[PDB]
Paper text:
Inherited missense mutations in the myocilin (MYOC) gene, within its olfactomedin (OLF) domain, constitute the strongest genetic link to primary open-angle glaucoma via a toxic gain of function, and thus MYOC is an attractive precision-medicine target. Myocilin has no known function, and there is no glaucoma phenotype in Myoc knockout mice or in individuals with a homozygous N-terminal truncation mutation or hemizygous deletion of MYOC, but rare non-synonymous coding mutations lead to toxic intracellular sequestration of misfolded myocilin. Among the common features associated with pathogenic myocilin misfolding, we demonstrate that a single metric, OLF thermal stability, can robustly segregate benign from early-onset disease variants.
Assessment of spent media from cells expressing each of the 16 full-length myocilin variants revealed WT-like secretion for T256M, R296H, L303I, S313F, V329M, S331L, T353I, A445V, V449I and K500R. Structural integrity was further confirmed by high-resolution crystal structures, which were solved for 11 OLF variants. No gross changes from WT OLF were detected for the structures of T293K, R296H, L303I, V329M, S331L, E352K, T353I, K398R, A445V, V449I or K500R, indicating that these mutations are accommodated within the native five-bladed β-propeller fold and do not perturb the dinuclear calcium-containing site.
Numbering used by the authors: 244 to 502
């Protein structure tokens, strides 16, 4: 059931980090789960610091919300920022101090592919407005895997490319007119990129949309609340049809409605 985003619900807090290491981070579920994982499996990465390698895995939602991890993976290379996603059994993440996206197969703890995003800025060139080295933001929607970034040629405007999930090849690329550093985060629903106006305000909005099918850009005014005043990560999960976010220690989710 695809459509245009028309409404975002109130943020629901699912878990609160207990240490400064989790002030910002990324938490994820797989919209295309593969054995031995399920739709309940959750991954959490606390991303403060300079050698981020621990990925907490939870077999069950109950464990994610109330307990300890069922497994901890130690990544073979440190990770950059909050942009990572899980898709069809692999964690896709950006190597620290690089423009390299890495496909890490979770069940075998193996790197399956690595790819430089051509021309992509990295390490504070085209972050979202809060900074945090958020130059490169992976995304999953109803059609698969994407990457959101910018380049010098695009003068910092958001660029998005569809990615082959097996080998990380770029399949198609679109250039918007939205300055990436002017928005708080972004995500893709049904092939339309949406941006968030502010990472601090209780009265933020979903403020722009770019439809990859038509090339048309629009301005929106859909209310979006940053309950804890510091959202570092905002992504869409196309299986649950919800936003997943990280806001000032808190792993939160938002219902949405499409029309
Ligand atoms: Ca995002
Ligand atoms: Na992301």
């Amino acid at each position: 059931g695809c459509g245009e985003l028309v409404w975002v619900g109130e943020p629901l807090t699912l878990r609160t980090a207990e240490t400064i290491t989790g002030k910002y981070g990324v938490w994820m579920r797989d919209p295309k789960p593969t054995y031995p994982y399920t739709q309940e499996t959750t991954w959490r990465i606390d991303t403060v610091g300079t050698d981020v390698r621990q990925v907490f895995e939870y077999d069950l939602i109950s464990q994610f919300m109330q307990g300890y991890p069922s497994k901890v993976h130690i990544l073979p290379r440190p990770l950059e920022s909050t942009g990572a996603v899980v898709y069809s059994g692999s964690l896709y993440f950006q190597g620290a101090e690089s423009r390299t996206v890495i496909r890490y197969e979770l069940n075998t703890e193996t790197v399956k592919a690595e790819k430089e995003i051509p021309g992509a800025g990295y390490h504070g060139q085209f972050p979202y407005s809060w900074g945090g080295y958020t130059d490169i933001d992976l995304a999953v929607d109803e059609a698969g895997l994407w990457v959101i970034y910018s380049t010098d040629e695009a003068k910092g405007a958001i660029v998005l490319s569809k990615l082959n999930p097996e080998n990380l090849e770029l399949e198609q690329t679109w250039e918007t007119n939205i300055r990436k550093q002017s928005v708080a985060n972004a995500f893709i629903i049904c092939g339309t990129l949406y941006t968030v106006s502010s990472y601090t305000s209780a009265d933020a909005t979903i403020n722009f949309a770019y439809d990859t099918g038509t090339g048309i850009s629009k301005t929106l005014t859909i209310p979006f609340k940053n309950r804890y005043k510091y959202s570092s990560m905002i992504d869409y999960n196309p299986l649950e049809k919800k936003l997943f976010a990280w806001d000032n220690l808190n792993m939160v989710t938002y219902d949405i409605k499409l029309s």
